[PDB]
A paper describes a structure:
Propionyl-CoA carboxylase (PCC) is a multienzyme complex consisting of up to six α-subunits and six β-subunits. The α-subunit of LtPCC contains three domains: a biotin carboxylase (BC) domain, BC-CT mediating (BT) domain, and biotin carboxyl carrier protein (BCCP) domain. The β-subunit is composed of the structurally homologous N-carboxyltransferase (N-CT) and C-carboxyltransferase (C-CT) domains.
The α5β6 undecamer lacks one α-subunit, and the α4β6 decamer lacks two α-subunits on opposite sides of the LtPCC complex. In our decamer, undecamer, and dodecamer, the conformation of individual subunits is preserved. In other words, the structures of these complexes differ from one another only in the number and positioning of α-subunits. For each oligomeric isomer, the α-β binding site is either occupied or unoccupied. There are sixteen possible different LtPCC oligomeric isomers represented by seven oligomeric formulae (one isomer for α6β6, α5β6, α1β6 and α0β6, and four for α4β6, α3β6 and α2β6). In other oligomeric isomers, at least one active site cannot participate in catalysis, and so all non-dodecameric PCCs are less catalytically active than the dodecamer. Therefore, we propose that β-homohexamers are stable in solution, and the lack of interactions between PCC α-subunits allow for a continuous assembly and disassembly of α-subunits from β-homohexamers.
Author numbering:
A (entry chain V): 535 to 665
B (entry chain C), C (entry chain H): 34 to 522
The structure:
């Protein structure tokens, strides 16, 4: 069914079930045996032209993380100078009656000095420094 | 045979003809004019005539529906315009004005052609006038694949949507040489007018793509949404999705605490059909979301706040973004669906020093002037003038709905308690703010006054939206006679 | 009998009724509604009912021509709006929509009335919708005599012109208490939204007056210019001045050096009739002048650059100012006269970081969309896209004129010489820049192409303008059918 997950395919006797995650019209996100892949489905022109396309490399920066917006820090989660893993919440600012929660996108460890509780300073300061 | 394009591809770049071939259907492009020369006769230009004269204009066909397009050529004279280049574009736009067909242009010009004198200015003026006259008649989309400098930048600006390519494109009015000459600062071309700058800082570019191939692939998808002309109806496509699909996950999206945040996409995605959202300006003014989507196989317009970013507070940039989206959607008879969650306007001196009064009025003007069917859903809160601006029932709204835990009040409980008791005995906070929030920060009063049609379970939103949007298919409303409005610029 | 107004005058302030009496004719005001109560029945408001309910609405008559007006009252409840106050204003605006009459309002409200709940929001929404619908049908003028805070600020914004009183008026969206609460900065009310701030920084206020008496006296003079409605013709008044008055002082205004500055008013004043200029926004974006004036007894619109300030360079603020003026002038069929002297656009990073591309397109859109008769005079220079924007002949201009020492070129001589000779032998400056400026920085080439009708002596400008404006009295031009445009916001 269009835009749905389950996809039942049966060649001869063999039967398989795959899943359809999403796409950007050149790359298809399909699941095979409980694993995500990205298959490219392109015609003759797209195939012959995709060779002549720049492939830039994104910035790989392991450095200090700053608070996007002003606020107040009410709760902290991580400890100064210990291990940090991707997807871990680090602290929570509260602004105009709203607690956000900036986390650690991706890294192994940190070296820094924690901003103490109730420090209504923010203004894009260095709350946690990753080194 | 791959002649004369090896020099181009060696620089990791594509050609105009290749871009045109990628955009349209496999074999449905008919180039209109191909043997035209510049006839300049100045500054040693009497030689080196070119057959195509740096432009490729044709008709093409996308998804079985007609289109018109033109593409600049960087190899020939740097893509400069002339008295002769602009004639082809003018002819294409005039033909696409007679017939109800849109126009899409891939800009690559390096600037004006100096060897023609003021004829380049003449051509620019003609193109500007055609864009001005035909805006609101046929949709216009522009993509910038390479450099775009000088006064040629203005014609993409008048167009409805402008997209940018990441690595090898930029746009600005004046070059960095003049900036160094007058101010004395050394800034590179990318630092001045790169795609990121216009994606985040200036708000001109409506999107950014990583490659030309992806740009074409998604431009086709965007084109699948638009109506063909001003008088043609909104397209409807077949779809296996149905209004009876169960959405009970909406009962839990809103947290029971009033100070916790949530993602509005968790409310947007269930209501619309699967994998049918095309966000517009995703990296600019993130506190508001705008884009296109389909509901039961017909394209609609989506405008919702987001408490994830800055508590979902209206601002200057958000106001401009929403105003432009609403104006375009209404110009071509596209239904509008809005989700409301706003505590007010962003407070700060910089805001008044930047003219919040002008900018915030644009969204209100766009919402009040609109005559397309509107549907509004109030999830959690709506305070002060923000409630009025975000498509309130009094602005000729068709149907308005609220969720059982909503709040519609003049302002927060603290300010109301302060103003209602000047020098009342101390500790008044505890036994007054709670009571006022209990009694008047609830949708019961607004429902008593008649400002919301009904209070609904969050699981019935898809059913209600499909029903209302099906019933409202044939509304005919007209404004008083005017030559045109006077919007607060 | 001077009862109950002694408390008001003691604070060096006037009353609403006194302001109304000062505005209209001596005995031609007929108050419409005077015995109306709030019927609230909440928070101990069942008592202290007021007969007028804080508003004075009537009809009046100015210079023998009808008008409609309303005035807030600060003594009664602080001027707060309600479900009942807004009804009178809605009735007045609806009546002034049926009949071709304008509306003028003197705002003094302290904010919304909390004791009514969401009914104040309902009234605000109704007033906003009426302003949105009737903008471009009848002219709307607003004057702010006292405090104006909260969401009530938006209705003056949609109105065509907003004026301010110096000592005792201010306007902003959010009070300084909230600013202190969130940001922590202590700013006074005047430092936040005083008349000077909106006169110079935000660009919202169209003027400032020293006293209420002077405000009324000059508001009458402004009203003498406007047409009564959308369909009524431009007013023409008797005048002893004649087109045959000698103006030979224009032969010497332009200095013979290209780097010396002059005042454009020395060119503006001789052409128009004596003592008939009403500048709009005099203290904001001084590099451009906009206002109203009379030519042979009929009101026209004036838009001219000024090389006195910043070399007469177009900018963001100037673009917004000119765009709003042109849009208003065209909406009501008022002729436009422009004087051109521009070297280009202002170069700087802040400009691109602030969106020059969006703002500079607004003036071009306003000039191209307009259908009223246009007259353009190029005094000294016009370069690049600035020449295109400032009402060039290709944008359906009626008549264009130039002065004998004008210059119309693609860009300055230095840049052209640089681009036309990449690595040409050194010292090329002396024998190339002079030659190029001599050969192509002159109106002869632009006249050869046909972009200026004729090259005239500066002493004939009044004669030519009067002749053309008399002949063009009955032009009928129409744009293609649209629900409305899509201007770059
Ligand atoms: O209570 C003190 C600060 C309350 C601010 C509440 C939000 S912040 C921005 C917006 N402006 C307001 O007046 N209220 C909201
Ligand atoms: O020659 C170097 C600086 C020339 C600037 C000339 C004026 S300044 C602003 C405007 N932008 C230009 O490119 N030219 C004018």
């Amino acid at each position: 069914k269009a835009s749905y997950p389950i996809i039942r395919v049966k060649d001869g006797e063999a039967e398989t079930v795959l899943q359809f995650w999403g796409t950007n019209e050149v790359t298809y996100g399909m699941q095979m045996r409980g694993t995500t892949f990205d298959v490219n489905v392109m015609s003759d022109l797209q195939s012959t032209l995709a060779h002549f396309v720049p492939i830039t490399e994104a910035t790989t920066n392991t450095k200090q993380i700053l608070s996007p917006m002003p606020g107040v820090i009410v709760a902290i989660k991580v400890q100064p100078g210990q291990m940090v893993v991707a997807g871990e919440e680090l602290l929570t600012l509260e602004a105009m009656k709203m607690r956000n929660k900036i986390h650690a996108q991706a890294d192994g460890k940190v070296k820094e000095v924690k901003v103490k509780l109730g420090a209504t300073v923010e203004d894009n300061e260095v709350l946690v420094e990753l080194e | 045979p791959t002649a004369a394009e090896d020099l181009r591809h060696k620089k990791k770049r594509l050609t105009a003809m290749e871009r045109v071939q990628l955009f349209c259907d496999p074999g449905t492009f008919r180039e209109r004019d191909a043997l035209v020369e510049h006839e300049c006769h100045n500054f040693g230009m009497e030689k080196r005539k070119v057959p195509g004269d740096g432009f490729i204009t044709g008709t093409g066909k996308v998804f079985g529906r007609p289109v018109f397009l033109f593409s600049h050529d960087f190899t020939v004279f740097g893509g400069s315009l002339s008295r002769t280049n602009a004639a082809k574009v003018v002819r294409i736009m005039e033909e696409a004005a007679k017939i109800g067909v849109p126009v899409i242009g891939f800009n690559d010009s390096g600037g004006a052609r100096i060897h023609e004198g003021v004829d380049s200015l003449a051509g620019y003026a003609d193109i500007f006038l055609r864009n001005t006259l035909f805006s609101g008649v046929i949709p216009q989309i522009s993509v910038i694949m390479g450099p775009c400098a000088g006064g040629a930048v203005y014609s993409p600006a008048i167009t409805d949507f402008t997209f940018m390519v990441e690595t090898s494109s930029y746009m600005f009015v004046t070059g960095p040489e003049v900036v160094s000459a007058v101010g004395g600062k050394l800034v590179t071309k990318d630092e001045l007018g790169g795609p990121h700058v216009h994606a985040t800082k200036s708000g001109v570019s409506a999107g950014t793509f990583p490659n030309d191939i992806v740009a074409m692939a998604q431009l086709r998808r965007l084109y699948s949404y638009l109506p063909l002309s001003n008088r043609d109806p909104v397209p409807v496509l077949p779809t296996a999705d149905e209004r009876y699909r169960d959405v009970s996950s909406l009962n839990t999206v809103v947290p029971t605490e009033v100070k916790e945040a949530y993602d509005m996409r968790d409310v947007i995605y269930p209501v619309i059909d699967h994998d049918s959202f095309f966000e517009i300006q995703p990296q600019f003014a993130k506190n508001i979301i705008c884009g296109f989507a389909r509901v039961e196989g017909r394209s609609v317009c989506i405008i919702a706040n987001q408490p994830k970013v800055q508590a979902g507070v209206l601002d200057i940039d958000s106001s401009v973004k929403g105003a432009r989206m609403v104006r375009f959607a209404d110009a071509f008879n596209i239904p509008i669906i809005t989700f409301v969650d706003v505590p007010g306007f962003l407070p700060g001196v910089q805001q008044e020093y930047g003219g919040i009064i002008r900018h915030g009025a644009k969204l209100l003007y766009a919402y009040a002037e609109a005559t397309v069917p509107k549907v509004t859903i109030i999830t959690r809160k709506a305070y002060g003038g923000a409630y009025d601006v975000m498509s309130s029932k009094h602005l000729r709204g068709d149907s308005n709905y609220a969720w059982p835990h909503a709040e519609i009040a003049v302002m927060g409980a603290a300010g109301a308690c302060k103003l209602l008791y000047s020098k009342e005995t101390a500790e008044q906070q505890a036994q007054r703010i709670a009571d006022y929030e209990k009694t008047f920060c609830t949708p019961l009063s607004a429902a008593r006054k008649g400002f919301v049609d009904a209070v609904i379970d969050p699981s019935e939103t898809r059913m209600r939206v499909c029903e209302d949007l099906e019933r409202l298919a044939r509304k005919q409303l007209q404004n008083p006679w005017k030559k045109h409005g006077n919007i607060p610029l």
